[PDB]
Amino acid sequence: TQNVLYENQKLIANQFNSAIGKIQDSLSSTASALGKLQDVVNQNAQALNTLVKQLSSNFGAISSVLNDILSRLDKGDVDLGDISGINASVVNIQKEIDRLNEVAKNLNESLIDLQENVLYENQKLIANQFNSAIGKIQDSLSSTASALGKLQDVVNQNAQALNTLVKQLSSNFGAISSVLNDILSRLDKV
Amino acid sequence: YENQKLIANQFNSAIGKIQDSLSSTASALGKLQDVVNQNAQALNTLVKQLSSNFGAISSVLNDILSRLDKVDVDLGDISGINASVVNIQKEIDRLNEVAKNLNESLIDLTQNVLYENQKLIANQFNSAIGKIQDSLSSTASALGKLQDVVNQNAQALNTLVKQLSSNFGAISSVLNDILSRLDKV
C-alpha cells in the first residue's frame, strides 16, 4: 500500500546516505595514509642515496691513505668496489591520492534527497558491470598482499645481513686496534 | 516494490564487497607501515654503526701514519643522515571501524512522485557505486606501486650491505698485512 511504498523509499534513502558518509570518511583516511607513506618512502630513498654518495667519498679517502701507508712501508695500490651504482627509487602516487580525495568530495552529489520493467532490466546490467570490476579490484589487492608477505621475508634477510656486517666490523677492527696497540708501544713517533 | 527489493539487495551485496575491499586496504596499509618502518630502522642502525667504525678506522690510520714518514685524516660525518618513520595507525584504525560500522547501513523490509523517487534512488546508487569502484581501483593502484618501490629500495639496501661487507673486508685485509709489515720493523 501507498504509505509502505514511500516509507520504504525513506528507509532506502536514510540507510544509503548513512553508508555514503561513512565511505567518504574511509576514502579520506585512505588518501591521508597513502600520502604519508609516499612521503616517508621518498624521504628514506633520499637518505639512502645520500648515504651511498658519502660512503663513496669516504672509501676513496681510506683508499688514498692506505696507499700512502703502503708506499711509506715500501721505503702498492688499493681499490674498493664502487657502490655508486646503488640507487634508491622514488614513488609517485599523487594521481591516485587526488582521485580518492576527489571522489570523497564527489559523493556529496550522490546522496538521496527525496521528493516529499525496463529499469529493472537495466539495473540487472549495472550490477553485473560493478561485480566484474570489484572482482578485479579485489584480486589486485590480494596479490599485493602476497607481495607484501614476500617483502617481509626480504626485509628480514637484510636484517640478518645487517647484523652480520655489524659483528664482522667489530671483530675485524677491534682486533686491529689491539694489534696496533702493541706495535705502537714498540715503535717511536716520527 | 519489485524494483524496491532489487535495489535493496544490490546495495547490500555491494556494501559487503566494499567492506572486504576496505578491510584488505587497511591490511595492506598495516603491512606497508611495518616494512617501511623496519627498513627505516635498519638504515639508521647502518648509519650509526658505520659512523662508529669510520671513527675507529680514522684513529687507526693516524696512529699508523704517526710511526711512518716522508714519501690529515678525518672522514666525513654521516651520523646526520636519518631515515624518518611513518605513523598511519589512526587512518588504518578508522578504515577498520568504518568497514565494521557499514553493517548499520545494511537494509531489510501522485504515482509520478514515487516513480520519480525510485528513478532518483536508482540513479544515485548507480552513480555512487561507479564512483566508489573507481576510487577503490585507485587505492589498489597506489598500494601496488608502493609495494613496488619499497621492494626496490629494500633490495638496494641488501646489495649495499653485501657490497659494504666486501669493502670493509678489503680494508681489514689490507690493514692486517700492513700490521705484519710494521711488526717486522
Residue numbers in the entry:
A (entry chain A): 1 to 75, 82 to 122, 135 to 208
B (entry chain B): 6 to 76, 83 to 120, 133 to 208
The authors write:
The spike (S) protein mediates SARS-CoV-2 entry by binding its S1 subunit to the host receptor angiotensin-converting enzyme 2 (ACE2), and subsequently promoting viral and cellular membrane fusion by its S2 subunit, leading to the release of viral genome into the cytoplasm. The S2 subunit contains two important domains, heptad repeat 1 (HR1) and heptad repeat 2 (HR2), which are highly conserved among coronaviruses. We designed a recombinant protein HR121 from SARS-CoV-2, which could highly mimic the conformation of the HR1 trimeric inner core in the fusion intermediate of the S2 subunit.
However, it was unexpectedly observed to be a dimer in PBS by Native-PAGE. As such, the four HR1 helices in HR121 combine to form two sets of trimeric HR1s. The outer HR1 trimer (α2, α3 and α4) also bind two HR2s and one HR1 (α1), but its two surface grooves formed by two adjacent HR1s (between α2 and α3, α2 and α4) remain unoccupied.
